[PDB]
Design an enzyme around this catalytic site. Structure first.
Site, short mmCIF file in Angstrom:
data_model
loop_
_atom_site.label_atom_id
_atom_site.label_comp_id
_atom_site.label_asym_id
_atom_site.label_seq_id
_atom_site.Cartn_x
_atom_site.Cartn_y
_atom_site.Cartn_z
N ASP A 23 -18.91 48.39 31.29
CA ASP A 23 -18.98 47.56 30.10
C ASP A 23 -17.61 46.97 29.84
OD1 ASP A 23 -19.22 46.34 27.64
OD2 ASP A 23 -20.33 47.99 26.72
N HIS A 75 -14.16 50.18 11.60
CA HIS A 75 -15.35 49.33 11.73
C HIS A 75 -16.65 50.02 11.39
CE1 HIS A 75 -12.89 46.31 13.45
NE2 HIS A 75 -12.70 46.93 14.60
N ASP A 120 -4.07 47.08 11.78
CA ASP A 120 -4.79 46.82 13.02
C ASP A 120 -5.08 45.32 13.11
OD1 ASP A 120 -6.81 48.57 15.10
OD2 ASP A 120 -7.50 46.56 14.63
N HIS A 179 -7.78 43.88 14.13
CA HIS A 179 -9.17 43.58 13.82
C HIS A 179 -9.43 43.85 12.33
CE1 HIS A 179 -9.30 44.42 18.22
NE2 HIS A 179 -10.22 43.47 18.23
N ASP A 215 -2.90 47.38 18.16
CA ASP A 215 -3.29 46.18 18.89
C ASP A 215 -2.80 44.90 18.21
OD1 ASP A 215 -5.05 46.34 16.68
OD2 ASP A 215 -6.83 46.59 17.94
N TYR A 260 -4.07 49.03 22.64
CA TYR A 260 -4.65 49.17 23.97
C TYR A 260 -3.70 48.94 25.12
CZ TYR A 260 -8.59 49.08 21.01
OH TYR A 260 -9.46 49.39 20.00
#
Ligand SMILES: CN(CCCCC(=O)NO)CC(=O)Nc1ccccc1
Ligand SMILES: [K+]
Ligand SMILES: [K+]
Ligand code: NA
Ligand SMILES: [Zn+2]
Length: 636
Positions: free
Chosen positions: A22, A137, A174, A176, A267, A307
């Protein structure tokens, strides 16, 4: 008062991973935790932290933020084989499951609660939890974006329930958007959520209209949700600091939280393949430092994303360094935010103007990637040296110390004969103390900063500044509380003078910031507004090698906040000259210089006269000092 920093980590949270192909998910690897902890151990930081054991979050704790139906479904995944785990993961967006991920999710959540308990019980000052899976999330009834349970939502709900807190700040840096956190506290004014995030006009994952600046919360929670979308990649240190000075910090210090929780995803650092931003790992030392004066330093940092295994280790270390109180690295090359960031900043400030004092004046007419590896950060042997008047014996924190060699005394004679004629043998002493303290501050990592009480400002200021300039300190920021002019020349590019005075004096050139603050009950709000929105942006762009604080003898329960925040510059090297003995001001100055906890301000709004004076200063200075900008420049 509390001491130390907790580090909460367990190798067990690295014992789940992706089991099928994935490309969406394959970046989220166990090695993120191992590389992060090992980086902390290599640099000696883990060894300085209080290791606090991980625990499982209980069922009751999970039900604080999630539904019984979703918990029961996740509780079944340890019994699932690979086919079944893949089919279960496909019910959700960008998340994978593994026989051990439910176990690890309860540990990530339990570790967070352990961190909250250690901080709120005053067992440590602050701390960090290195956890997997991340949380910001995940939603009431859904896994999402590598998250199973919402670790940081847990932490704030738990701190509300078990410590009866009324105001919690959550900072999600972060890259995101933490939509799970936003949904969870959308209607709750007790929890203020700030998030910046790659958005690119809703084309970046998770592609949500409600990640835009216009989502301010709902109902009684309007104003307590603050989204700052990044609509271009490549954001820099300047963009991040502009976000803090002109959006986050004005709101946070007015909110006055009782606890700060950071959703700390790295990230958002240079080299990350998800964020594609350009901020250096060193910026996280300052993002941490700028929030530490909130809530008496009670800060729980919780790992989210990040990451690039290399920028990840370095940014984790920069955060822990700052939690431990190590000196902040100098940030060079700062300037204006880019146009896209300034647009985002201006848009969020405008929509938030209905809710927050700092912005309220905007509503009316009146108005293969490489980067230099971070340098070593060393706590000074003794952090603060203090020189009170002769024979004034005070009780010093364990990292402070009292104040003259033959070399030094010869220098004061040399200086006296040329420039001063002065014979007051006690002034001559203070000049010997200034030179002795400055030599220890600049020559080695033995001493970091200092406070000296003095009698004559003119000779003291001149010897301090002129001796600093030949250390050599290429740049010196001077911060002066008082009236009159000092023997300080700002004609070359080597000195910037901030002056907080009582009489409105015409500031004429752009190496001086003169703040004439209307005396009254409004003064504390005005000063803090000037500190975050003017003083800190200029100081950070100037990037001094030394800070020189000066207080004349002719009230300011803001001094501790300034002394703390201004240590973000010059690796914390600040010399403060206090004219006349004041027991309380000297105790406060030494406490903040030594890295002790700052007492909160509590409660409010400043005078329109002061806001107008400050914005005139911004208009006068922002063309030279672009970090002051919080609107898009008008092109010719
Ligand atoms: C990374 N996911 C979810 C983001 C959550 C991570 C985080 O750090 N949240 O805080 C988005 C995605 O679709 N990536 C992707 C897809 C195909 C090929 C390459 C990359
Ligand atoms: K965020
Ligand atoms: K909220
Ligand atoms: Na999928
Ligand atoms: Zn992220």
């Amino acid at each position: 008062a509390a001491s130390g920093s907790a580090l909460i980590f367990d190798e067990e949270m690295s014992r789940y991973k992706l089991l099928w192909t994935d490309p969406e998910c394959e970046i989220e690897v166990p090695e993120r935790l191992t590389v992060s902890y090992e980086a902390l151990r290599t640099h000696g930081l883990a060894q300085r932290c209080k290791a606090v054991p991980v625990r499982q979050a209980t069922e009751q704790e999970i039900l604080l933020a999630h539904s019984e139906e979703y918990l029961e479904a996740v509780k079944q995944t340890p019994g699932m084989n690979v086919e079944e785990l893949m089919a279960f993961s496909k019910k959700y967006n960008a998340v994978y499951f593994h026989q051990n991920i439910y176990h690890c999710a309860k540990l990530a959540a339990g570790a967070t609660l352990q961190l909250v308990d250690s901080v709120m019980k005053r067992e440590v000052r602050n701390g960090m939890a290195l956890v997997r899976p991340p949380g910001h999330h995940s939603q009431r009834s859904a896994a999402n974006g590598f998250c199973v349970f919402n670790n940081v939502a847990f932490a704030a709900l738990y701190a509300k329930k078990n410590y009866n807190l009324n105001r919690i700040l959550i900072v999600d840096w972060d890259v995101h958007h933490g939509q799970g956190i936003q949904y969870c506290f959308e209607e709750d004014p007790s929890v203020l959520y700030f998030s910046w995030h790659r958005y690119e006009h809703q084309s970046f994952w998770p592609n949500l209209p409600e990640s835009d600046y216009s989502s301010v919360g709902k109902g009684k929670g309007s104003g307590f949700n603050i989204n700052l979308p990044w609509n271009k990649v490549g954001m820099t240190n300047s963009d991040y600091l502009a976000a803090f000075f002109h959006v986050l910090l004005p709101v946070a210090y007015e909110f006055d939280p009782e606890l700060v929780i950071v959703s700390a995803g790295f990230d958002s650092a240079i080299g990350d393949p998800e964020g594609e931003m350009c901020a250096l790992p060193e910026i996280f030392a300052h993002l941490t430092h700028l929030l530490m004066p909130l809530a008496a330093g009670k800060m729980c940092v919780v790992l989210e994303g990040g990451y690039n295994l290399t920028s990840l280790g370095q940014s984790v270390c920069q955060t822990v360094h700052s939690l431990l109180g190590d000196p902040t690295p100098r940030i060079s090359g700062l300037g204006t935010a880019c146009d896209s960031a300034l647009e985002s900043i201006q848009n969020v400030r405008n929509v938030q103007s209905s809710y927050w004092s700092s912005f309220k004046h905007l509503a009316q007419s009146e108005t293969d990637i490489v980067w230099p590896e971070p340098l070593k950060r060393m706590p000074a042997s003794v952090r603060t040296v203090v020189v009170p008047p002769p024979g004034v014996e005070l009780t010093l924190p364990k990292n402070c110390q009292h104040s003259i060699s033959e070399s030094t005394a010869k220098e004061v004679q040399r200086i006296r004969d040329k420039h001063f004629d002065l014979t007051d043998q006690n002034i001559l002493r203070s000049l010997g103390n200034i030179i002795s303290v400055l030599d220890r501050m600049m020559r080695s990592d033995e001493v970091c900063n200092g406070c000296v009480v003095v009698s004559d400002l003119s000779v003291s200021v001149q010897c301090a500044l002129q001796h600093a300039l030949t250390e050599p300190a290429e740049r010196v920021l001077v911060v002066y509380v008082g009236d009159g002019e000092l023997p300080v020349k700002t004609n070359d590019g080597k000195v910037f003078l901030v002056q907080i005075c009582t009489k409105e004096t015409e500031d004429k050139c752009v190496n001086r910031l003169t703040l004439c603050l209307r005396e009254g009950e409004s003064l504390t709000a005005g000063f803090m507004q000037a500190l975050l929105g003017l003083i800190l942006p200029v100081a950070y762009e100037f990037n001094p090698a030394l800070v020189l604080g000066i207080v004349e003898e002719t009230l300011m329960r803001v001094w501790g906040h300034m002394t703390c925040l201004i240590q973000g510059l010059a690796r914390g090297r600040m010399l403060t000259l206090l004219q006349g003995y004041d027991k309380d001001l000297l105790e406060l100055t030494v406490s903040a210089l030594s890295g002790a906890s700052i007492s909160p301000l509590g409660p409010r709004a400043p005078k329109p006269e002061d806001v107008e004076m400050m914005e005139k200063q911004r208009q006068r200075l922002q063309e030279r000092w672009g970090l002051l900008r919080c609107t898009v420049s008008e092109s010719w």
